[PDB]
Amino acid sequence: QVFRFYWLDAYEDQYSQPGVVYLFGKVWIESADAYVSCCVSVKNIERTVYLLPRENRVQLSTGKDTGAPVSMMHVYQEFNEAVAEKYKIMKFKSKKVDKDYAFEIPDVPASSEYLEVRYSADSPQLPQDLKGETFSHVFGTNTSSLELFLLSRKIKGPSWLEIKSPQLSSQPMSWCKVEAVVTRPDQVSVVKDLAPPPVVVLSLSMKTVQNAKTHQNEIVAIAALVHHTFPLDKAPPQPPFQTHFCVLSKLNDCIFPYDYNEAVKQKNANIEIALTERTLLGFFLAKIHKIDPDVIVGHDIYGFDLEVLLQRINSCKVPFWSKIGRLRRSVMPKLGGRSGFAERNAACGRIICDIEISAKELIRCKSYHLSELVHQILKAERVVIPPENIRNAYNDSVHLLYMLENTWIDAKFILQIMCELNVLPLALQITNIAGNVMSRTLMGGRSERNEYLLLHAFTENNFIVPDKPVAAYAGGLVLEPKVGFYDKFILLLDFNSLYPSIIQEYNICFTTVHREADEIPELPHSDLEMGILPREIRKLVERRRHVKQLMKQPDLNPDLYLQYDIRQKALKLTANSMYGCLGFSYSRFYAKPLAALVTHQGREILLHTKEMVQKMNLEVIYGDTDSIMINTNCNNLEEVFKLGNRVKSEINKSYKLLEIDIDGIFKSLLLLKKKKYAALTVEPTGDGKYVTKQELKGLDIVRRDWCELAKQAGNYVISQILSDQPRDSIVENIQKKLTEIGENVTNGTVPITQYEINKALTKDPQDYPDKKSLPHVHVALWINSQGGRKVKAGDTISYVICQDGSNLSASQRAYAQEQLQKQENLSIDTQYYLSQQVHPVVARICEPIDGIDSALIAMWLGLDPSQF
DNA sequence: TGTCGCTACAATCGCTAAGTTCACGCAGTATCC
Ligand SMILES: Nc1nc2c(ncn2[C@H]2C[C@H](O)[C@@H](COP(=O)(O)OP(=O)(O)OP(=O)(O)O)O2)c(=O)[nH]1
Ligand SMILES: [Mg+2]
């Protein structure tokens, strides 16, 4: 009678169907000897409200205090007489429950007795501020059905579920293969210790041509790759894709090449040629229904792909739109709005993976557009078709097939990127840790993950969580650097998980720090037991430590090493976001006093460590909120390691959980400012042999907002300055290289790509006020003016500042590289680069350097020293 | 419709206020009527 399946996604409609949640997942059907998508509708999820009784009865209007003690019987009688009649509640089940509370609502005791009352989700929802003569507060009034279900059944991310006494649906309600109806939450249970089942992953790339007549993006091809046995707990398979299907349509007025049909037939691929976008969309929807993928992956899927698909479906009136998801509906949610919420609702039941968002979360790159990711991750070169060539493709079979194969290659690259970063396993792990839904986790962001983690933690410990909500404080202390150049051995000491460790050691929790509704609250007493937040953060820290230890294994595959590093960084960021959400104004658990206490303890710890190290007769030259840089004044590495171990042990002796570890040994350092230095990191190889690795932190050479020419010049200068050559030779080489770069720029021998400068966008180009015209924004608008895919918020834009004879400021002459290559009145402003891109960076680098100054750099670059 | 925290640096733009130059008065000498 039981029903075991692996649930992946959950969907709830607060307005359409009250008290109903649909769970989508995989179920093993023995006859087919494979998993089939199944949907389970958990109905009758009653809403629970906790009422806080008063100590004594109070008159409602007079605001008096009669003095009659208020018991649970009196509370129930009042709710049955006044409130039940007032708000038209017919049936409700009432019981007395002893629950805890420690959050930001005044006059609520830590532990007290409440009258839990439930009733159907069809009944009206009580107001959040409801009060009465016998009760002073009502909680959980705005509790969503999904949250109630997840917290009641203790479901934490994807996992196997067992359903008792399943029912059959009267009529089909989902596009899946198996359906089942659960009459109550209590009939659903969780079964642990079972491997996740392989899922279907569909990677799709589409090419569109915009109609300037209506500024509508019309789809002309969809190249899609599918793998039916993609694992969620193992390494990506090779080859990453099993089979594929291609669909290619024509425009409204253009026609196919002469012998397109014969060439397509000879190609032997699964090419299905749809005459019109309507037939193409119908075929795509039928294919999606047949495959029924569980994880649809793409690039800009949430921003461009799904939005265009749904808009064209609506325009062409493709009958069964709801097949894009897994539920059966008739009315499409209104498009637009912020975020991909419309897209997510449209694709309900399918986990949408946007490798753009995932790449932004996982790695750091100068640009996040597909070509840059392909070059950086896969180390391949991507051929880009200009939109004019896409329009002109309808003139020969060869070019049309080239366009289709380019779409196919883009889809393959998207799948390869998804597999390389290991996005799906990491999403599963983080979802299990947090306990939210996987689609939200893959949508990005840290607030929901930590919020659901703390929801699960507090709920399981008999606590009433706060109702969902419908530089504030000081931070870390940065030591004043001893700016200069150091040629001896510098020993770096860095704390491990400093803020998690502070939370653990000092027992900082909602139930331990007695706040008061900007003074740092008192530390908790050492008598109290460990709180919920220390326990959760300790679990996170232990998981990260386990991953790091697993990384230390010798002879590891470099790809597996990078995957482990990414996972460790993700866990570190998860813990740091758990800390940060305490100081998030819109968070469910906004506890600014707790964050202030944590930061104050961090500052105190750093100050104490600095004082201890200085009291040890050692030199301290830098430190950023958890770290210290020490000038050993030694040239032997063994003594450096010995002293480092001694000082690390001495510092660790004063703490119970906080530990200090030797971060690295720098043979040479260039301390310029706060958060700006370059060093030759030393990694010992053995038998007294060590390898020197360069390391730049915060310099302009490691920033995407500078031209690659300036970055190259600064890198060469830093390499020379950090070398062991005599100073005179270093200065001579710097002069020679600067003269060479000046000659190259003056003679136009530099490659054009070295002039690009990248600046990201915060809002849409339209939403930027008319604050003159910020360079990138300027170019951004041009890109939107031109006939190409628009540029939205959070998109990098590479522009080249060029001469136009305008006698205007540089910031108002920013242009795209294609603009320069096209227009005959635009030329690269050589003087601008030589004076404001190369000179500033090298001058900043060489500030503490003897023999080099701004005037000398200008002279070597061929500029006029006068102004400098 | 959501949206982790804070600290630091750097370029750009607007504002604006001190600093500067250029021009108006007085005194003297001189030339030229
Ligand atoms: N909220 C938040 N806090 C951060 C972030 N990055 C760093 N911090 C805080 C918490 C860290 O413990 C502290 C020191 O930074 P670290 O990069 O050395 O990380 P941490 O010491 O926690 O761990 P680790 O040294 O990598 O083992 O600064 C962040 O992105 N968000
Ligand atoms: Mg650290």
| DSSP sequence for A746-798 | HTT-S-GGGG-EEE--SS-TTTS--SS--HHHHHHHHHHHSSS----SS--EE
Tokens for A218, please give them. Answer: 């019309």
- Comparing every residue's Cα with the C1' atom of nucleotide B10, the nearest one is A700
**Nucleic chain B contacts, protein chain A, residues 631-690, CB cut-off 7 A:** 673-676
Q: Are residues A267 and A355 in the same domain?
A: yes
A769 CA, B17 C1': separation in Å?
28
> Which residues have C-beta within 8 Å of that of residue A251, sequence separation ≥ 6?
A209, A218, A220, A394
Cβ contact A476 with chain B strand, < 7 A: yes
Query: Residues A308, A443: one domain?
Result: yes
Q: Nearest CA to A221 among A235, A206, A239?
A: A206
CATH number of the domain to which A140 belongs = 3.30.70.2820
Give Cβ neighbours of residue A194 (< 8 Å, ≥ 6 apart): A160
Other beta carbons within 10 Å of A185 = 18
A594 CA distance to ligand 2 middle (Å): 20
Tell me, yes or no, whether A85 and A229 share the same domain: no
Spatial contact of A209 and A251, defined as CB atoms under 8 Å apart:
yes
**CA→C1' distance for A860 and B22 (Å):** 40
From residue A378, alpha-carbon distances to A270, A300, A374, A736, A796 in Å are 26, 18, 5, 36, 20
Q: What is the DSSP string of A616-676?
A: TT-EEEE-BSSEEEEE-----HHHHHHHHHHHHHHHHTT-SS--EEEEEEEEEEEEEETTE
Cis-peptide, bond into residue A240, ω within 30° of zero: no
How far apart are alpha carbons A622 and A257 in whole angstroms?
Answer: 67
- The torsion defined by the Cα of A277, A278, A284 and A288, in degrees rounded to 10, comes to 150
Closest CA to A23 of A348, A443, A346: A348
Answer yes or no: do A141 and A203 share one domain.
no
- One domain, residues A325 and A245: yes
Is the CB atom of residue A848 positioned under 7 angstroms from any atom of strand B?
Answer: no
From the list A757, A719, A710, the residue with the least C-alpha distance to A738 is: A710
Outline where A445-484 has alpha helix (H): 447-459
Ligand 1 within 6 A of A584 CB?
no
Give the span between the Cα atoms of A226 and A241, in whole angstroms: 6
* Strand B atom within 7 Å of A576 CB: yes
- Counting DSSP H helices and E strands in chain A, the numbers are 26, 27
- Decide: A626 in ligand 1 pocket, CB within 6 A: yes
Ligand 1 near A446 CB (within 6 A): no
Whether nucleic acid strand B comes within 7 Å of the CB of A771, the answer is yes
Ligand 1: which of A626, A627, A659 to mutate, most ligand atoms within 8 Å of CB?
A626
Same-domain status, A136 and A239? no
DSSP β-bridge partners for residue A463: A100
Residue type, A446: R
Ligand 1 neighbourhood includes A497 CB (under 6 angstroms): yes
Give the side-chain half-sphere CA count within 13 A for A784. 13
Centroid of ligand 2 to alpha carbon of A682 (angstroms):
19
Whichever domain contains A297, its CATH number is 3.30.420.10
Residues A339 and A208 grouped into a single domain: yes
* Whole-angstrom distance, CA of residue A209 vs CA of residue A251: 9
Evaluate if the CB of A470 falls below 7 Å from strand B.
Answer: no
C-alpha dihedral (A528, A533, A536, A542), degrees to nearest 10: -70
Solved how?
cryo-EM
Residues paired with residue A588 on neighbouring β-strands, in sequence order: none
Instruction: Evaluate if the CB of A811 falls below 7 Å from strand B.
Output: yes
Residue A572: CB within 6 Å of ligand 1?
A: yes
For residues A117 and A46, give the distance between their C-alpha atoms in angstroms, rounded to a whole number. Answer: 10
d(CA A45, CA A121): 7
Contact A434, A452 (CB under 8 A): yes
Is A365 found in the same domain as A293? yes
Distances (CA, A) of A125 to A37, A89, A145, A668: 34, 10, 12, 67
The resolution, in angstroms to one decimal, equals 3.6
Same structural domain for residues A349 and A238?
yes
Residues lying close to strand B (Cβ under 7 A), chosen from 187-206 of chain A, are none
Does nucleic acid strand B have an atom less than 7 angstroms from the CB of A417? Answer: no
Q: Which nucleotide is nearest to A811 (CA to C1')?
A: B12
Atom of ligand 1 nearest to the CA of A496: 27
Residues A106 and A226 reside in one and the same domain? no
Residue–nucleotide distance: A478 CA to B8 C1' (Å): 9
**For residue A432, what are the domain limits?**
199-450
Distance, CA of A713 to C1' of B32, in Å: 71
- Same domain? For A258 and A397 the reply is yes
Residue with CA nearest ligand 1 atom 4: A576
Are residues A426 and A357 both part of a single domain?
yes
Are residues A81 and A89 in contact, defined by beta-carbon separation less than 8 angstroms? Answer: no
C-alpha of residue A462 to centroid of ligand 1, in Å: 31
Residue A40's Cα: distance from chain center in Å? 30
Distance CA A574, CA A840 (A): 37
